[PDB]
């Protein structure tokens, strides 16, 4: 029978209108964006409109947005810039970062690398076993005079848990007043919003952050992204990683990928127009899925890994485990004929055999983490599809148990 | 009426077959290439075929090829790796780079930044005003114990002049034998092949290089790129700029842009299939352009800037000045009704004009250089279109000088 995709957290398909915007730009807007000829001008008009659509999506200003190759580049760029700024201000002190124990690889690994190289100091703040969040008291307790950036993801890709970013920013703003009075540089705050965009409202003024990472392929756009920098070139400096021909105000040089930008901008227009519909629909079907998993297997057999009492999570995500010695997450997914899902981050799928380090940093019991499955629903996902998926998981576990 | 594009050195349109390959991958190959299910492995297979197509284009092996966002990333990545590797083996010497005085902004500016921040030393070798190349003996005379990289553009964007990259690699390999015996680390060689791909044969084995920059939008492909690394992960070290999810063997992590890669793959295919025919057609129509310009303005009025006797150049590029006090490049082009071209690196406000620094580096007399136009033709340019373009340059200059 027909397949049901429930791995939207790993990647989303392109919206038809986004593909249409890309195809048009491929044919019509092929010229160099810098040129005084009509195909270059059309390209420049594409890029300008897309920058405005992205700013509208996050409630910022187009001057605060630069286009990048993706989420990984945007996240590396923030970190890099903070090091270079600190070096500019010195040239044996090192800059210090505060982040969480559960960040995407594109934050965790540049950070670990900086410590391995003795370039930076980093505090990885654990998440509470009670809330599933970094306690903001802990982030603030970790502050030292050499601290320059707090980077805390908006929502976790594996659990859907939403982090208290607005409160972190607010506490950092009150602290920065004491610091400036003491002659210490202000601390900046980044959020990796990769998983939140298109699923719940992301507003840079409600968030209060200085930087924000945008990831197209998480909200039905193409595999590029962007970076928001508050008061870019004015209140917040940004030291490029790349050097070249002057594109993106020299913050990110290289001839602009016009068709990808047309796509990102169109994807952002859709989130602006429809975010409220998307969120509500995802929520209904994810909550339905949870209800139908407990009806079919039993409350006693299901551990809802994404659920902490009173903690916001993404509306589409359900991380759960079914009790049984034979029902490791990868092993169950291999027996499914309908469900397409994951047992973690797409880029850690190789290591599907051992529990997710992320679930383990969330305090998920080792035996429950072995059996963990991440189901993430999308814009098209229906309750009918949820019924087929649960009936697929029902047959799968029976075959692993009859073996 | 109809306009004629002669600015293909700045960018090219996409081939129809390329667009088709991209739009198909958008609909069909959208799953995460890291994911194990059905949709993932379809994307993976698009990426592997594309990397095979890239390999075949340059005469290499798919294991030696990583995908990047474009040529600027690829160029910066090579310079960055050499610095991080030097810092690795030191664990107050600095790494040293030899390059030319005529490189693209994505090579010159990252090196210039490195010398400004005191991270590296750089020798910008000038070009010979007899050959218009950076002679190999001048490159070898720049070598010092801290030298780790020579990077020399395969063909120049401005003039289309081809550099002697094979002889550079051959001599450096020979110098490297004596180095390793003296305990010194070997010198690696990079070429920015941006302007040569799809215009002439490019073969990693004939060029001898350790790195080579590939740029899709210069051969009717998308606005992404790739980097060849000889013996990647075995013989030649690459130290990444980016850190993340393990993609491109951890040399360039980040989820793979599969429709762009599918495009670049298709564009690489068309080059392998048709490089000879593209080259010959280009050379035909460019040569016709130059004979038409001379027939129409006179041999005395036209200064061909690209041209050094017995020096190879791209088949499609014609950089030339028309003699006259009013005829700065941008002034003539602004008067044209058909021709679309460029003035390359030249600038103009209203205080005055600045000729291309690149042409001045080739020794073009300042006054000639101020009048320089870069015309670069493409796969579809016809002799009939050249004729329209010469007619247009004629009416353009006529209105400027009476
Ligand atoms: C997908 C994602 C990113 C960006 O990763 P890419 O592989 O470059 O697209 C960053 N952070 C989170 C939390 C993500 O889910
Ligand atoms: C066009 C070009 C590049 C790469 O430039 P991008 O803007 O990144 O596409 C590199 N080298 C040369 C010689 C070029 O012409």
Residue numbers in the entry:
A (entry chain A): 29 to 119, 133 to 444
B (entry chain B): 29 to 119, 133 to 443
Paper text:
Interestingly, human SCL (hSCL) is unlike several bacterial orthologues specific for Sec and does not accept the sulfur analogue Cys as substrate with any appreciable activity. SCL and CD enzymes are NifS-like proteins that contain a completely conserved active site Cys residue (C388, hSCL numbering) that form an enzyme-bound persulfide (Cys-S-SH) or sulfoselenide (Cys-S-Se−) as product of the reactions with Cys or Sec, respectively. Similar to the non-specific SCL/CD enzymes, hSCL was found to adopt the canonical fold type I structure of PLP enzymes, forming two active sites in the homodimer interface with each monomer contributing residues to both active sites.
In the P212121 structure, the segment containing C388 (residues 385–396) was ordered in both subunits of the asymmetric unit. Interestingly, it adopted two different ordered conformations in the two monomers. In subunit A, the segment was folded onto the protein in a near α-helical “closed” conformation, restricting access to the active site and placing the active site C388 in proximity to the PLP cofactor. In contrast, the corresponding active site segment of subunit B displayed an extended β-hairpin structure, positioning C388 more than 17 Å from the PLP cofactor and exposing it to solvent. Remarkably, in spite of the completely different backbone architecture, the closed conformation of hSCL positioned the C388 sulfur atom in an identical position in relation to the PLP cofactor and substrate-binding site as observed in the group-II proteins. The persulfide adduct was present in subunit A with near full occupancy and also in subunit D, but there at lower occupancy. Together, this strongly suggests that the closed conformation observed in the present structure is involved in catalysis and C388-sulfoselenide formation using Sec as a substrate. In particular the density for Gly 393 of subunit B was poor. The hSCL structure shows that in the closed state, relevant for sulfoselenide formation, the reactive sulfur atom of C388 is buried in the protein and completely covered by the residues of the dynamic segment.
